[PDB]
Amino acid sequence: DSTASRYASALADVADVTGTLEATNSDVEKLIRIFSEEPVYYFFANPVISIDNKRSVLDEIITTSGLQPHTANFINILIDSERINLVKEILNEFEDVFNKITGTEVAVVTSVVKLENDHLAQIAKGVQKITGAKNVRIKTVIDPSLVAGFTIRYGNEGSKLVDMSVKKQLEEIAAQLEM
Amino acid sequence: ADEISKIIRERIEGYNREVKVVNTGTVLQVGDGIARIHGLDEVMAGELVEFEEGTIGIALNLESNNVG
Amino acid sequence: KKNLGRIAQIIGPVLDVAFPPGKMPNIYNALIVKGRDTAGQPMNVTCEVQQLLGNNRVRAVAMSATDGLTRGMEVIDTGAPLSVPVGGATLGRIFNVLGEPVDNLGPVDTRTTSPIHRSAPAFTQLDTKLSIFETGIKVVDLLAPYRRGGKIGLFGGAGVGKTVLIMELINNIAKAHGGVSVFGGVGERTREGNDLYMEMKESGVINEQNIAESKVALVYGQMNEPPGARMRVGLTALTMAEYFRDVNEQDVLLFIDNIFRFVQAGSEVSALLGRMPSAVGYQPTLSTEMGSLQERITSTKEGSITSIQAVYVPADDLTDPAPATTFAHLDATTVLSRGLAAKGIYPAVDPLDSTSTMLQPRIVGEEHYEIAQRVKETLQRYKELQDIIAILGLDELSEEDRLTVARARKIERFLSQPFFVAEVFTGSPGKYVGLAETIRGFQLILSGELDSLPEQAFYLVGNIDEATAKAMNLEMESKL
Amino acid sequence: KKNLGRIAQIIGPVLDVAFPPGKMPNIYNALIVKGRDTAGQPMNVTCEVQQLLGNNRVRAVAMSATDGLTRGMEVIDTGAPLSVPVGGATLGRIFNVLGEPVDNLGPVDTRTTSPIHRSAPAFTQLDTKLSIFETGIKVVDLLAPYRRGGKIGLFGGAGVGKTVLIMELINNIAKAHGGVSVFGGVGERTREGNDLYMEMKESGVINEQNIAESKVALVYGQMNEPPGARMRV
């Protein structure tokens, strides 16, 4: 694994052993939305700033957004150790680890136009059957690359890919060369 | 997000402006020989920096966050 | 283009620049850095992308000096892999690796610029006509003939030859070859580059009066340039020669001096770049980079790029990776030895080690091949008797083998040459001697017909007739 | 009030100390680490700040053994580099790196002391004295004559006279040069240590009756005492 994945797995194990899992995931989404917007990330980095000031402003930004107590201790430990400069990647891989532990698996469907909810739920049935995940989450992205249908980027991270799309004519012309 | 936290944001930008000075930065680590200063996104390679105690030094290593 | 860069880190000559995510340059893509100079605002230092680090930043070696560059300086990618101006305008001017004039004349035109890092010529089109070449040197026209339109290597220790030989070879051939010559000062010392420029402009090759007429087109990435520059001035010379072989349809004669700099600068940049160190200290991709230079030099049915790289053997480590990879590419290699220079036999070309694949008999001539075989065998017998001679005395060997020893001495001194450009070191004028004349000399030397002349009568002598005359001179000076 | 920090990380004879964020010691500023190394309480593990690791942490190498040091003790900084006693009170006592006499006969007087780390003597105040001196050996007096007022090394492998020349040269010129010799053996077979100290008190240079009249100041950082010592003997 990576260090970010290790910290994310720690936070996910906490969200397991304490019954605050979905609240923890929502709080991590809030926290990564926070630790975007470069000024605050640069503030929590740049170790010349005193650790006391850093943890005090951390306490304030916790009591502002009202995070879960345990994830507040998590980001506080991240500040305590010198591995706070990884916090964006950690909160990013938390989605991976949370979904893997909870049993949900992400399926990215890319279609030329917005995909309707009924057929999206049918694609969810398909991805759920081929993978074996409980509450498969389909985050769709409208892309102009294709021509007619959809690509499914389900799997660990992008790895598996099934598609009825511009890849059809692509394979057609490519194996039409056949040289 | 960070809507009502405008006072916290003013605090963090104040602390940044306290630590983020133009052509100025702390010495993170000063080993035997080299010193590893932080900041100084204005300097070029080989720029004689001053250490405010009477010892100039050249900057041969412009890494990402710390200038060696 | 327009894709601003914001250089992140500058660790020595290697600077990596954090492009936006969507708009990232490809590998080997020139990056002109809009950066300040030591005094004044405008300065364009060039960089080529070496690898894409994947944090939206790409590592680029610097073609100009890395001093004066700010973390956060704006920089655009050209989108063109470091184009170099070639054509009729490149004739007569000393060129940087960047593709600029260094001779402070009027600037060149950008009408026929060419990319510097291009793909190799395909094996489907390779002209292979085996034709011997008469350079002018006794030994390396006889003992190791050169392949016209084929690579040639002047290996040697630090200062045994390989630059005075390059100067004499260009002084000989660059007049004869109708096609132009493209000299590349790859990491050569600047003062020898100055000497070569002066010698070219005095020998009518440059023709300073009509600069657009010259039969030579220099590029200097000389010794005092950042390791990016010496990494690619060889490719600049190759781009000029490849243009003159792809379009102008003329056989060109590129002299690269110290091709070992094209590997050592690669070492100094590969250390910082993040690539792991290889054997004795060179880059990992020593062989593939060296091949990326050497393979583009091939006679390709439109012309013939004959080339003489003055490979530098690091402290005469003839097993080091930098010459060990170039021996595979170099057809008519010529190992110059400090051992045969410390005794003053110049040129310091080794009679044994210097070998060529043009010494096949049906290619080089049967009698010439036989004389070369007999000379090499006599020198090998002398090198094997060097241990008996040095320890047990010259007398303790046979009296036929003593004739072979004296004959080997006569031969290894006769294959000395007064160069025209080495007259300042010798003090004596130079004698250019053809191929058939050195064959006719060696025939009479090793046929035992003239084993009476003193050994010094064969030293630094143009032809066997001049050796006969020097024998008379020495016999008169002995009693007088 | 010398600001004390807590020792955090210990790697052999090199220990990293965490200080309060305000005041970190200067380079080479001695940290006499307090604490306990036995049933009693000797606070004799002194260390010297080699390099500032940043984030109020300093690597300090210990001039003694680091056994008996727990992560989380209390260390103080003297404020000045490691001070050793010098002067007339020094002449005639086997010294360690710390500055305490090992011959356990006289507790030294540290009123006249100096830090071990000093800047080089400036270029102006050197000597134009280029005088030859006579050692008392044929070879090193004829072929490579030694130089008064200069550093005179004698290289050599193991087991080849490299210490018998030092001892014989001591024997030849110790009383002749009325200047007080200072044997500073760094990495010395301490058996040769007792041999040399006994030869000194036999040859009459160091006096078992009078300490001031000894005109020699041995310093022993013998081949033990992890390299915090042998780097500073």
Ligand SMILES: Nc1ncnc2c1ncn2[C@@H]1O[C@H](COP(=O)(O)OP(=O)(O)OP(=O)(O)O)[C@@H](O)[C@H]1O
């Ligand atoms: N004049 C001499 N007569 C007899 N033996 C001698 C003489 N000079 C030197 N030796 C030999 O040299 C050896 C001393 O070895 P050496 O001087 O290399 O030790 P060293 O490494 O210098 O010791 P240290 O580490 O204390 O400096 C002795 O064992 C001795 O046998």
Ligand SMILES: Nc1ncnc2c1ncn2[C@@H]1O[C@H](COP(=O)(O)OP(=O)(O)O)[C@@H](O)[C@H]1O
């Ligand atoms: N024919 C010769 N006569 C006299 N001296 C020579 C001759 N050839 C070479 N030398 C001496 O040997 C040196 C070898 O050339 P040099 O330019 O040093 O090679 P490199 O460029 O590899 O250092 C010359 O500088 C010259 O002094």
